Amino acid sequence: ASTATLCLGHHAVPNGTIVKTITNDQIEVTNATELVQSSSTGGICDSPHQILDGENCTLIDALLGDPQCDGFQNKKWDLFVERSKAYSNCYPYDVPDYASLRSLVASSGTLEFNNESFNWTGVTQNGTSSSCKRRSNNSFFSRLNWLTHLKFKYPALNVTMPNNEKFDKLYIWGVHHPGTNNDQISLYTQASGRITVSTKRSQQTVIPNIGSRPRVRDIPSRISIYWTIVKPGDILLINSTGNLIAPRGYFKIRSGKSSIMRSDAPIGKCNSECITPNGSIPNDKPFQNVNRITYGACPRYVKQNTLKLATGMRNVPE
């Protein structure tokens, strides 16, 4: 009357992990894996995305032609990285809808600039100022042309420029607001008159407003920046009597995967597809708690700092 015994069973481990389920906020399993990326290496990887470090320059300063940003001329980028240390070091300016211009340029992803020979007859070109020095000599925004009188006269400008190309043209121009009446007349020999940049499909008119603003870099005047997009078959019509900061050409507009990010993280020679303002992070996990701002193939941001996915059975010690 001999017998035997056969017991079925499962394994267990001495170091289990707590996970959540539908019915239990704390249940221990043999193994788990983290689904939330919570740490950053620290630095932004210069690959595989084309990074452009703005250094002391904002995107708009490089666009206009701030002398300290001349190295940026005609550069492309997948991601433009603006630094908090940045500062404008040229003629004081403001942009109505600054955020929108910054966005559409960042989304375009290029600063390619083609020069066009505008017919400025009867006017002086290449105006300069002591507040915008280039090579220690008085200069101006590299992509803008400060127009002034020639023989103490400033005639009505009615200039034309057609877009006979296959692509769109982005024109950046501005209006000068002299700080005093005497400056208006010594610059344009006339009382401030409105400017009008128009196309077959649009129309923008601006009034120069003379008056003193708080001085910045020893300048009580101001420049206001505007932009116009001219599509193929359309024409750019400038209609001014003074105070015009004219364009020297146009920028190309592209459509793609480019953008811009505010960050103070250093650029390194590594390879990572996901970029946050804190630096690049791995993207093996489906979620991340590092930063809501991301660029590239990134995990989705969530508020939890940890989420354990069970990869083993329940742990039952002896």
Binding site: A4, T5, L6, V19, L35, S258, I293, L309, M313
Partner: protein, 173 residues
């Protein structure tokens, strides 16, 4: 578990079992041994790897989006941008919380299921030659040498060989 095997009628796991997730322990005239079952172990592992493949390595490319930090007070438009992003983050945070809870509940249930399948598999093999003691162990009512235990472990145990011996030992007064 919904089958009552793991943390159920199986009182606890075996830390000495390192070559598999499920297996057999036996006692006979030749001693006491342990061996892992490969099929049930591999069934649970493959299902869990299937979960991971869906969740790991698959991310989404986003490039130009909206601004999410602001240095100036703007009012209406800024309120909408903050609200949109806050709404988005809360919904994804909810998805992540529910996903892990559901996945973990299912993982615990499926590993309990594989334990029960092996138990059922073994019970049917033994037919009338063994009885379930209630704690995942079978009393086998015949001499069971190591080669006979091996035959049960890889599904070649022939119950007719020992049936006469087993029925006599089960139904003795």
């Amino acid at each position: 578990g919904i089958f009552g095997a793991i943390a159920g009628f199986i009182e606890n796991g075996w830390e000495g079992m390192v070559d598999g997730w499920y297996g057999f322990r036996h006692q006979n005239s030749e001693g006491i041994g342990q061996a892992a079952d490969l099929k049930s172990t591999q069934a649970a592992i493959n299902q869990i790897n299937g979960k991971l493949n869906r969740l790991i390595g698959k991310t989404n490319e986003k490039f130009h989006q909206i601004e999410k930090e602001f240095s100036e007070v703007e009012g209406r438009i800024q309120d909408l941008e903050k609200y949109v992003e806050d709404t988005k983050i809360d919904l994804w945070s909810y998805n992540a919380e529910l996903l892990v809870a559901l996945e973990n509940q299912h993982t615990i249930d499926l590993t309990d299921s594989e334990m029960n399948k092996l138990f059922e598999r073994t019970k049917k093999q033994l037919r009338e030659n063994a009885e379930d003691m209630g704690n995942g162990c079978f009393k086998i009512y015949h001499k069971c040498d190591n080669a006979c235990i091996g035959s049960i472990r890889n599904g070649t145990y022939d119950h007719d060989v020992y049936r006469d011996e087993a029925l006599n030992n089960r139904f003795q007064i």
